[PDB]
Amino acid sequence: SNQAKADAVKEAFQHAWNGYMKYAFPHDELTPVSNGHADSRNGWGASAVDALSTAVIMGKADVVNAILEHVADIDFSKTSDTVSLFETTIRYLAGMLSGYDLLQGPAKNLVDNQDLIDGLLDQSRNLADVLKFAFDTPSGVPYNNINITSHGNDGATTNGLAVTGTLVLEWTRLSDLTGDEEYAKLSQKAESYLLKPQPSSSEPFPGLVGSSININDGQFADSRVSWNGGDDSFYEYLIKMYVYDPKRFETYKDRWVLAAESTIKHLKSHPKSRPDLTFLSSYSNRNYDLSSQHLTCFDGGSFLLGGTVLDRQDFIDFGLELVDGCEATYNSTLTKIGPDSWGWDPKKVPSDQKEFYEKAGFYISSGSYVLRPEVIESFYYAHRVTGKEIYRDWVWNAFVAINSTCRTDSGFAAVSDVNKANGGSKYDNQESFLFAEVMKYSYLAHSEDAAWQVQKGGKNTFVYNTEAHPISVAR
Ligand SMILES: *[C@@H]1O[C@H](CO)[C@@H](O[C@H]2O[C@H](CO)[C@@H](O[C@@H]3O[C@H](CO[C@H]4O[C@H](CO)[C@@H](O)[C@H](O)[C@@H]4O)[C@@H](O)[C@H](O[C@H]4O[C@H](CO)[C@@H](O)[C@H](O)[C@@H]4O)[C@@H]3O)[C@H](O)[C@H]2NC(C)=O)[C@H](O)[C@H]1NC(C)=O
Ligand SMILES: *[C@@H]1O[C@H](CO)[C@@H](O[C@H]2O[C@H](CO)[C@@H](O)[C@H](O)[C@H]2NC(C)=O)[C@H](O)[C@H]1NC(C)=O
Ligand SMILES: *[C@@H]1O[C@H](CO)[C@@H](O[C@H]2O[C@H](CO)[C@@H](O)[C@H](O)[C@H]2NC(C)=O)[C@H](O)[C@H]1NC(C)=O
Ligand SMILES: O=C1N[C@@H]2[C@@H](O)[C@@H](O)[C@H](O)[C@@H](CO)N2C1=O
Ligand SMILES: [Ca+2]
């Protein structure tokens, strides 16, 4: 049953890994339609590193060894492109760190070469060392777009909320494993400005803050509140840091609880045509933006995690409502895959979507699907927290729809219109998170229990970074 399904996901992973190895390895990614390669992540082999934690969990030794051997020859000091501190941190840094915690722990019997495993930590350190100058600013808020050779930057005056608040988990984990406090100090200092917002007008409601921060003084530059892309990950890490080490980050939890409560009270929103559906809106100076993104669907999972860890049934209940809403965007389309963005503002319903809106509860703003995992991610937590089978089926239904409409001879491709036969047209693009997240959460939902699985209450020994890379908790 679930075993057969678990094997089905491993086949889909193997399928993409074979196509990647066949036409793109060691480049960052496979272009799934032309069977070529691309390097959108500085050329260190993003898809190989992002696939590591998933391969280890799936018990694929051959894949794990091939990746470890490539990690050994990476020179993180050379790249012809500018580097994103955020992208590099959540994929490469967390990816190697995850592999290390996994192979050194619950998966210790999977690989023989202990040198390739220790190399993961060494390379993680080398990577942080080449990037840390990004934090050398007046406030400590880093420049996200840097040139690692000249030490130059974007010239940017502000740094985004998510790009600033989604670094602490992996940089602190690096300090905890190396004994060198420098990494934790830098990221935590940048995070400090987000925990104590100034001006006070940048925090419209308790716990909800603006979307950008001034690099010079660390003050917020706007009061736009949102859980959408650009903001998302900041709130996610608030509660996750608490799970990582409740003794050191109790303060992060308090801030998350404030954010969670204000979100329920002010951002909660129901479509006119479907009062039974719940989505999150955006807020700016008293005005509400009645639209959301596939990216935002990570929210249900956040509420569920904090809910079970804090034993707050109200967060769990709200999280389930967010999960239902996102599930609604998936099962209402022709392909059974949800759109990249949608809206429910009665005054802006497109004429050609009027009837869709009346029955579904929303209209599609962008119908593309770029292999994102947020909806499956939240379905995964819903199942782990409630133990209900329905959420596991929703993961399966989504996986089959992706495998059926996105699959190509070499891998999986992004699609242009989830509300058209076969997804409209295929994009020649396969992001590394296909390996890291879509395949992992889909597999975990049907695989056996293990330390790396999300747990209820205070039993978690691993916490997932925003790219689905399991990191071992502190102590
Ligand atoms: C396509 O997407 C649809 C939208 O997500 C999805 O619809 C359903 O999805 C959920 C299916 O389980 C369903 O949620 C459940 O709703 C139960 C009934 O709700 C009604 O009664 C309650 C009274 O308490 C009212 O408050 C509601 O407004 C509504 O009138 C509810 O009993 C149930 O709660 C139990 O289970 C949860 C955990 O699963 C516990 O936490 C809880 O304590 C209860 O034990 C749960 O909330 C949801 O209502 C429904 N959505 C809508 C709007 O229709 C479709 O299933 C999906 N289609 C396919 C084919 O996949
Ligand atoms: C990062 O900064 C370095 C500076 O060392 C840039 O190096 C290039 O600078 C010029 C750009 O055309 C040319 O002189 C060479 O291409 C090269 N020379 C140096 C100084 O090494 C590099 O282009 C920057 N990275 C990018 C592409 O943004
Ligand atoms: C995902 O898609 C693949 C390919 O369409 C399915 O595997 C197929 O493998 C062969 C063709 O590629 C054939 O044997 C079948 O078309 C099919 N496999 C079976 C079941 O016979 C794969 O089953 C799909 N995954 C799921 C679980 O639906
Ligand atoms: O804006 C984004 N945030 C998410 C990330 O948190 C991660 O899930 C993937 O990089 C990818 C997944 O949808 N990310 C984005 O594009
Ligand atoms: Ca994420």
Q: What is the 3-state secondary structure (H, E, C) of the chain?
A: CHHHHHHHHHHHHHHHHHHHHHHCCCCCEEECCCCEEECCCCCCCHHHHHHHHHHHHHCCHHHHHHHHHHHHCCCCCCCCCCEEHHHHHHHHHHHHHHHHHHHCCCCCCCCCCHHHHHHHHHHHHHHHHHHHHHHCCCCCCCCCEEECCCCEECCCCEEEHHHHHCCHHHHHHHHHHHCCCHHHHHHHHHHHHHHCCCCHHHCCECCECCCEEECCCCCECCCCECCCCCCCHHHHHHHHHHHHCCCCCHHHHHHHHHHHHHHHHHHEECCCCCCCCCEECEEECCEEECEEECHHHHHHHHHHHHHHHHCCHHHHHHHHHHHHHHHHHHHCCCCCCCCCEEECCHHHCCHHHHHHHHHHCCEEEECCECCCCHHHHHHHHHHHHHCCHHHHHHHHHHHHHHHHHHECCCCECCECCCCCHHHCCECCCCCCHHHHHHHHHHHHCCCCCCCCCCCCCCCCCEEECCCCCEEECCC
Cα–ligand 1 centroid distance for 346 (angstroms): 24
Vertex 159, ends 155 and 161: CA angle to 5°? 170
Strands 279-280 and 282-284 come out as: unpaired
* Nearest ligand 4 atom, CA 370: 13
Nearest CA to ligand 4 atom 6: 466
Which residues, in sequence order, are bridge partners of residue 158?
214
371: left (phi over 0), alpha (psi -120 to 50) or beta: left
286: left (phi over 0), alpha (psi -120 to 50) or beta: left
CA gap 6, 163 in Å, rounded: 34
In whole angstroms, what separates CA 246 from the centre of its chain?
22
Q: Is 405 in the pocket of ligand 4 (CB under 6 A)?
A: no
| Residue whose CB lies within 8 A of the most ligand 1 atoms, among 304, 324, 397, 400, for a mutation test | 324
C-alpha pair distances (Å), 299 with each of 100, 186, 224, 264: 28, 27, 18, 11
- Please report how many Cα atoms fall inside a 13 Å half-sphere around the Cα of residue 234, on the Cβ side: 30
Nearest to 33 by CA among 44, 24, 25, 46: 24
Neighbours of 286 (CB within 10 A): 6
Query: Cis (ω within 30 of 0) for the bond into 199?
Result: yes
Nearest to 337 by CA among 423, 264, 429, 410: 423
Domains of the chain (ranges; CATH) run 1-475 (1.50.10.10)
Cα–ligand 2 centroid distance for 144 (angstroms): 18
CA gap 384, 463 in Å, rounded: 14
CA gap 345, 118 in Å, rounded: 53
Vertex 322, ends 320 and 324: CA angle to 5°? 70
The sign of the torsion formed by the CA atoms of 194, 197, 199, 205 equals positive
340 is catalytic: yes
CA gap 404, 419 in Å, rounded: 14
Nearest to 52 by CA among 19, 22, 80, 17: 17
Considering every ligand atom shown, identify the ligand nearest to the alpha carbon of residue 389 and give its number.
Answer: 1
- Please report how many Cα atoms fall inside a 13 Å half-sphere around the Cα of residue 456, on the Cβ side: 10
**Contact criterion met (CB below 8 Å) for 123 and 74:** yes
User: Which residue ranges are tagged as binding site for Ca(2+)?
Assistant: 466
Cα–ligand 1 centroid distance for 77 (angstroms): 51
Cα–ligand 1 centroid distance for 276 (angstroms): 9
Nearest CA to ligand 2 atom 11: 80
Strands 287-289 and 282-284 come out as: antiparallel
Q: Is 230 in the pocket of ligand 4 (CB under 6 A)?
A: no
Q: What distance, in Å, lies between the first and last C-alpha atoms of the chain?
A: 37
Cα–ligand 1 centroid distance for 267 (angstroms): 21
Vertex 385, ends 383 and 388: CA angle to 5°? 40
User: Which residue ranges are tagged as binding site?
Assistant: 466
287: left (phi over 0), alpha (psi -120 to 50) or beta: beta
Q: Is 281 in the pocket of ligand 4 (CB under 6 A)?
A: no
C-alpha pair distances (Å), 345 with each of 90, 106, 145, 270, 348: 34, 48, 35, 10, 6
**Contact criterion met (CB below 8 Å) for 242 and 252:** yes
Nearest to 58 by CA among 15, 94, 14, 90: 14
Strands 145-147 and 363-366 come out as: unpaired
- 67-72: long-range contacts (C-beta < 8 A, 24 or more apart)? 67/99, 68/99, 68/111, 68/113, 68/116, 68/117, 68/119, 68/120, 69/116, 70/25, 70/26, 70/45, 71/96, 71/116, 71/119, 71/120, 71/123, 72/116, 72/119, 72/123
> How deeply is 179 buried, as exposed, middle or buried, from its count of CB atoms within 10 A (0-12, 13-18, 19+)?
exposed
47: left (phi over 0), alpha (psi -120 to 50) or beta: alpha
Helix pair angle (374-386, 313-331), 10° resolution: 140
**Contact criterion met (CB below 8 Å) for 161 and 194:** yes
CA gap 267, 257 in Å, rounded: 14
Vertex 133, ends 131 and 138: CA angle to 5°? 140
Considering every ligand atom shown, identify the ligand nearest to the alpha carbon of residue 89 and give its number.
Answer: 4
**Contact criterion met (CB below 8 Å) for 412 and 371:** yes
Among 28, 232, 340, 417, the active-site one is 340
Tokens of 104: 């050194």
**Contact criterion met (CB below 8 Å) for 129 and 81:** no
Nearest CA to ligand 3 atom 24: 403
Q: Tell the residue number behind the tokens 């639209």, with chain if given.
A: 291
Give the phi and the psi of residue 235 in degrees, each rounded to 5: -70, -35
- Please report how many Cα atoms fall inside a 13 Å half-sphere around the Cα of residue 157, on the Cβ side: 4
* Nearest ligand 3 atom, CA 400: 28
Q: Tell the residue number behind the tokens 């300090």, with chain if given.
A: 175
Q: Calculate the dihedral angle through the C-alpha atoms of 290, 296, 300, 306, rounding to the nearest 10 degrees.
A: -110
Nearest CA to ligand 1 atom 25: 276
Q: CA gyration radius for the chain?
A: 21
CA gap 133, 186 in Å, rounded: 10
Vertex 431, ends 68 and 78: CA angle to 5°? 55
Nearest CA to ligand 4 atom 10: 467
Report how this structure was experimentally obtained.
Answer: X-ray
In whole angstroms, what separates CA 77 from the centre of its chain?
26
Tokens of 284: 């700016």
